[PDB]
């Protein structure tokens, strides 16, 4: 194997990266990496587009809840399970989407906003934190309030050097698990120095009090790594290249002409360019033909092509960056060159695979943990009532009661008719159900059925024709 040797002709003699684990390769330069990621996101056209694409395609404009408890494992009964599901869905739909935005203490976000912020933070920071607390002062029905904790806040106390059990402000027990997180207060101008406080991950009763979501790379990864490390250098260098090229184009186009003479500086401009001494401004009205002596001269400068191949090389760099981040080149660069239907659909599939992966993991895990943390108050506060003859209580199997799957926004097809024809033909055969077909459009099928069963009565009362779906 020449991969692990000197190389072709010893060209790789100096390439000896150290064999170190991810913990020893990320942590020493953690804060600078996160800061550079934020700086790229905050001051680039392409990075903000990548973040916006992540938010808009992973989640969208609505992130609905669909509760499907595991009744067979508990042994409660179908009707009771459905009654409980309907009640809990109604209660959650009331609590989540309040326009008073009182789910978080700051009163600035709804639930879908919080999921979108979680996805974005998972994009340009590699990790998200959510703190679930209570408010005894609040008189509302439900006392649960959540928060979003920026990853910069959670660090080692007083910047004390790192240790074995306590790495980067996240405490680790004897195994790889984590127990508590040191989180600091943040006041930008001043006041007393930052006070680092302790917040346990889980309360003694088993409830989840602090949330941390990130996908590991190796066996042990205390804190996550952002997605930009692959291509942080190239975006900065492309920024420098674009700014330099634009300034060079301005400079080259600025100097229109050139005058060589031997008289006074103003007399030469008076007699050649035609300015008036009644530097000396020149009026742009009309055409002019100067008169020159043998000594004088006039030269009309010629500048190089403004865009001499820069577009193609920017195309190459954007292809590289799009490969690095995950979004397809056509989405990130807005180019949309002449492409057939096949190429466009293939590229859409390539984007959608990754977007489905991210939606299934990041937002889904955050939403599931949030929903369970809320469902504990409800069950306890008797806002809803558990079914009878339960084999296990709520605390024994939390996942059993809160087993849920969420619906996001669907895909906007390239050709609208063809997907509808596909869905209809699949429905006509037995291969797919109505629930999946109505879910791929971001609809809840029970609501749809209630809608048709009400619309048929409305049409009957008003005197119109019965609809197609009505049963004779």
């Amino acid at each position: 194997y020449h991969g692990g040797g000197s190389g072709f002709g010893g060209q790789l003699r100096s390439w000896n990266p150290p064999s170190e684990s991810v913990d020893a390769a990320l942590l020493p330069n953690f804060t600078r990496g996160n800061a550079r990621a934020d700086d790229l996101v905050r001051n680039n056209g392409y990075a903000a587009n990548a973040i916006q694409l992540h938010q808009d395609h992973i989640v969208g404009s609505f992130f609905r809840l669909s509760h499907r408890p595991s009744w067979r494992y508990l042994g409660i009964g179908e009707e009771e399970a459905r009654a409980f599901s309907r009640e809990v869905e109604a209660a959650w739909k009331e609590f989540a989407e309040d326009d008073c935005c009182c789910i978080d203490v700051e009163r600035k976000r709804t639930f879908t906003m919080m999921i979108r912020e979680g996805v974005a933070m998972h994009a340009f920071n590699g990790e998200l934190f959510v703190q679930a607390t209570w408010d005894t002062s609040s008189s509302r029905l439900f006392r649960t309030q959540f928060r979003m904790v920026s990853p910069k806040r959670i660090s080692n106390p007083n910047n004390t050097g790192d240790s074995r059990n306590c790495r980067a402000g996240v405490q680790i027990n004897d195994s790889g698990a984590a127990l508590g997180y040191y989180v600091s207060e943040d006041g930008y101008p001043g006041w007393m120095p930052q006070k680092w406080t302790w917040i346990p991950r889980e309360l003694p009763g088993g409830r989840a009090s602090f949330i941390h979501v990130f996908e590991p790379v190796e066996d042990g990864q205390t804190r996550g790594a952002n997605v930009f490390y692959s291509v942080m250098e190239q975006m900065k260098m492309l920024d420098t290249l674009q700014n330099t090229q634009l300034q060079s184009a301005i400079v080259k186009a600025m100097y229109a002409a050139t005058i060589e003479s031997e008289l006074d500086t103003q007399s030469a401009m008076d007699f050649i360019l035609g300015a008036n001494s009644q530097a000396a401004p020149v009026r742009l009205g009309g055409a002019k033909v100067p008169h020159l002596m043998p000594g004088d001269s006039l030269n009309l400068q010629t500048a190089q092509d403004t865009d001499n191949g820069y577009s193609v090389f920017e195309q190459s760099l954007l292809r590289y960056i799009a490969a690095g981040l995950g979004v397809s080149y056509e989405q990130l660069s807005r180019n949309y060159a002449q492409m057939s239907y096949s190429t466009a659909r293939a590229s859409a599939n390539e984007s959608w695979a990754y977007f489905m992966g991210r939606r299934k993991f990041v937002a889904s895990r955050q939403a599931s943990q949030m929903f369970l943390c809320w469902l504990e108050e409800a069950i306890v506060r008797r806002v809803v009532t558990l079914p009878s003859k339960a084999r296990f209580s709520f605390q024994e199997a939390r996942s059993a009661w809160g087993n849920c799957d969420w619906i996001g926004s669907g895909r906007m097809a390239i050709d609208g008719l063809k997907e509808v024809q596909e869905a209809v033909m699949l429905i006509e055969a037995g291969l797919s159900t109505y629930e999946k077909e109505c879910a791929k459009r971001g609809d809840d099928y029970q609501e749809i059925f209630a809608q048709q069963v009400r619309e048929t009565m409305e049409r009957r009362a008003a005197g119109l024709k019965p609809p197609a779906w009505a049963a004779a």
């Binding site: 040797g5 000197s6 010893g10 000896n16 074995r164």
Partner: protein, 243 residues
Amino acid sequence: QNLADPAYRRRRIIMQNMRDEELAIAQVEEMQAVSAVLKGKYTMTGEAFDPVEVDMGRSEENNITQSGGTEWSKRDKSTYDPTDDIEAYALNASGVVNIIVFDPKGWALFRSFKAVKEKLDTRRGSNSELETAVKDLGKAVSYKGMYGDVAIVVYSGQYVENGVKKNFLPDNTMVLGNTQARGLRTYGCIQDADAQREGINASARYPKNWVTTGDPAREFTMIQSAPLMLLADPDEFVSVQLA
């Protein structure tokens, strides 16, 4: 042929250093262990180390050393029973004795007696079985057969101080002792601010390395252990010079 970049060479050199450090620490541990048995006390000293003298009280009646009377070399090699003295020496121990350790010169001296030869080939007068002939000639230890009740062991180990090799046992000593004797293997606390920042204490063989950014570069390597070998009951053995 083959050959490698100047980097493989650094990984190989770095290892053999680890091996040497471990071997040196193990030698120090074993030297303390052996010196704790032969005589009651042993002294730890060096050039940069302030002398400390560990002392476990062993009675004067132990450490039997042969003198102008009662020595095996001067006495006849025929017509003499070594076994009689062995019992008299072992009467001084506290607790039963289940093993005997011979320095090979001492073993050659001991098996030369004809009476011990007679104890082997008796039909009903003993149950002792030895291996008088050559058994092990390269190994450090040679478990010979049980002689009566106690086992017989010949130990010829080598610790090197300076360039010259040296033997552990001091030239034909014999050490009566119990194979289940309560021995302690105590390891102290390491004193290194980096180690204590890492959170480690009271561990054996804490390894580390660092880069000193000097003119020729250089990265070192260091094992530190801080060992101390004790004996809970120092008078369970009986050391004999056997001259």
